[model samples]
Target: PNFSGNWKIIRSENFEELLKVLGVNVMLRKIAVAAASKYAVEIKQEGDTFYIKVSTTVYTTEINFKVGEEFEEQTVDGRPCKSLVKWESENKMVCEQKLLKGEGPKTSWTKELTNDGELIYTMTADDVVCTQVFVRE
Candidate 1:
């Protein structure tokens, strides 16, 4: 897949709120916003399965999933909750997460791949929406 590469976050809109939904504290969010820019993403694919790893100096998160399959996912750097995720389409990834520690909100993520090979990840929960744009590095 085109997504199998190292990438960096170039821009984020309402990402702070998304972090909040993921149970990330204010202090961590502050550090994340600054440090996340330097982070790198690595995605490895084997047949229909993929392993996505995001790493920075402060934190690292990894996820393993297969196309058209549902699996449990835990948000470590942010919300610290468990969720069910699935790839709904060739270019769309969806997640339904339950809030475990913080406020009363369920989260959902929709990911799409642009023609230019950029990855756009959008997160929504309780009327709060965040969009993260990543480019191959």
Candidate 2:
């Protein structure tokens, strides 16, 4: 699996609750929710290194890291954290993030380009689980 090119989010479930569980305030959540955003991701891989960029109307985030290597990353909400991405298989990638700010939750996210041909994001934080499904563009 190349995992390259771009993918756009086609559908999302429990995303609002996912943000709420991550501790976003009401006003912020509303602002984020009201953006009428289009979510997209671009990935470029070179050997063990992957360049991943996530984009929306509000902000664009870029991450460049190697598989099984650790790096510091800043979350979409501006919190800084430690991050590690590991390749579980040819089509699956797992990211573990540890929040470095005030007692925030640790999150583990998995991205799988399933054999059924859907690119999906499965994120877990405490009791919350959010799934966003995408398609190659």
Candidate 3:
């Protein structure tokens, strides 16, 4: 339940595919290419509300949501979605988003805390699976 922390991406797999799925343009796609561990995350959870800020050299975004409610959220490419974030376990957070332009029924993702306290952020949409591993900063 204690999810407040500052973390840095330690590694990742298939991040470019995530960009492609969101239909990123060629120029930005080139700029988006960074080594696997090039992003940062700051997160805070206060009772039922959570705040998350993710940053990389090319872009940054802040997401705010409540545990049991749905809200309008946007993906990295600025695509709108109806999003809901919930806890499947005390240390695992799962989210479902209805990407306005997604080719799937819904885009799903999970962030799980590893035994060593690192964060495993996995996103599954269409034919792609992207995973980012973050260590406390």
Candidate 4:
């Protein structure tokens, strides 16, 4: 995963659906949807390790992990989870996150960089999911 770039979230078609599935309150979802355009992603990769920072005017979240390694992670919304990253294909990376609360289910996210330079992020968690496309800057 060569995720070294500055990227912004231009659109999120399934934002509402995902938020609802994550058990977010209706009021917070409304606020989040309104500020979706202000979110940015900054990712840095050093060898097999990766540092990903997601920020918005309201809050910021960071993730640090290594390829093919499993780590305990605390989600942006304060949920504890177990995460792992693996190469699914030659140019694609997949991240699996298992929630450590309630029923303790698992979710997966896939990332792929297209030949034309578009970065796509797709995440599936519980009953909510979303896909966002980004451009390198």
Candidate 5:
């Protein structure tokens, strides 16, 4: 599926838990949760290359990469990591990240569009997982 438009989070589950699993401290986690509902996504695609920007009251993060290509990211928890995004199927996309230090747990995110056209985003790190739903904006 082409996610080349703006999106907004409509619902979420265990969002703060995912933050804690990512090693975010309680103070920052609280702030993130407070701003969660206002999260926005802006995505653009050009053939195999894609750009995705996430914006929230706390901060904005963006990524530019091609499917199957490796890229570097300053992760949400303030660590540098290598990442790859790939399509698992027509309606599912997954991204995996590994810390550059080689001592951190692996993390991944999966995105799938539902029949109702809402996007289901799942995040995982080790045994912790969370999900959020987004709608076209």
Candidate 6:
């Protein structure tokens, strides 16, 4: 149940609504949703530590963390937050984030690898859910 590989998004659902609920501007939201298929992720794992890099033409961000350990993360839209990632099962990893010093919705996401080797990444903010599916490259 390892999640180390290069993955490119193949499809996404409800992503624009998720960005809207998170307060992303209209122009950025349109660009994000329009470039859905161009999004990519690179994941590397060593022992309990995982390094994940997400990138597109517009932005790139990286995160490195150990399972069940808490850390600070800056979201793509520039929100500073305390974040924690944990294994929910052998094939599923979930991350939860809370704003460091503001009143905002707590957010969470799950990355799960299916038996067919597709990576399913799902995120939730407030009540909006976005699901993106990726295939290993």
- Among the numbered candidates, top TM-score falls to 6
Off by over 4 Å in 6: none
lDDT of 4 by residue, 1-137 (tens): 47789987655667777767767899998887777757788988887788998788978888889998998876434588888999887667988877777653356778877787777887776766777888886
Off by over 4 Å in 2: 34-37
What's the lDDT for candidate 2? 0.79
- Model 3 per-residue lDDT at 109: 79
lDDT by residue for model 2 over 1-137, one digit each (tens)? Answer: 77787998887776677678777998887766544146888989888898989888877889889989999887535678888988888889898888886767667788888887788888777778778888888
lDDT of 3 by residue, 1-137 (tens): 66789988877888777778877776676667573358888989898788999887767789888987998787545668888988898789888888766454346778888788899998776778888889888
lDDT of each: 0.74, 0.79, 0.79, 0.77, 0.83, 0.86
* Stretch of 10 with least lDDT, candidate 3: 99-108
Superior by TM-score: candidate 3 or candidate 4: 4
Q: RMSD in angstroms, candidate 3?
A: 2.5
Q: Find the candidate with the highest lDDT and give its number.
A: 6
Q: Is candidate 1 or candidate 5 better by lDDT?
A: 5
TM-score of each: 0.77, 0.87, 0.84, 0.85, 0.89, 0.92
CA deviation > 4 Å runs, candidate 5: none
| TM-score between model 6 and native | 0.92
Prediction 3 global C-alpha lDDT: 0.79
lDDT of 5: 0.83
Q: Going through the candidates in order, what is the number of backbone clashes in each?
A: 1, 0, 0, 0, 0, 0
| Residue-wise C-alpha lDDT for candidate 5, range 1-137, written one tens digit per residue | 67788889989788798789877899989888878768888889777788989889878899889989999986546689888989888878899988888576668888787778887888787787788899998
lDDT digits (tens) for residues 1-137 of candidate 1 = 45677878888778677678757889989886777556677888776677989788877878888766656665434555666657776766677876567665666777677888898877787788877789988
Give the runs in model 4 whose Cα sits over 4 Å from its true position.
75-77
Which portions of model 3 miss their true places by more than 4 Å? Answer: 25-27, 100-105
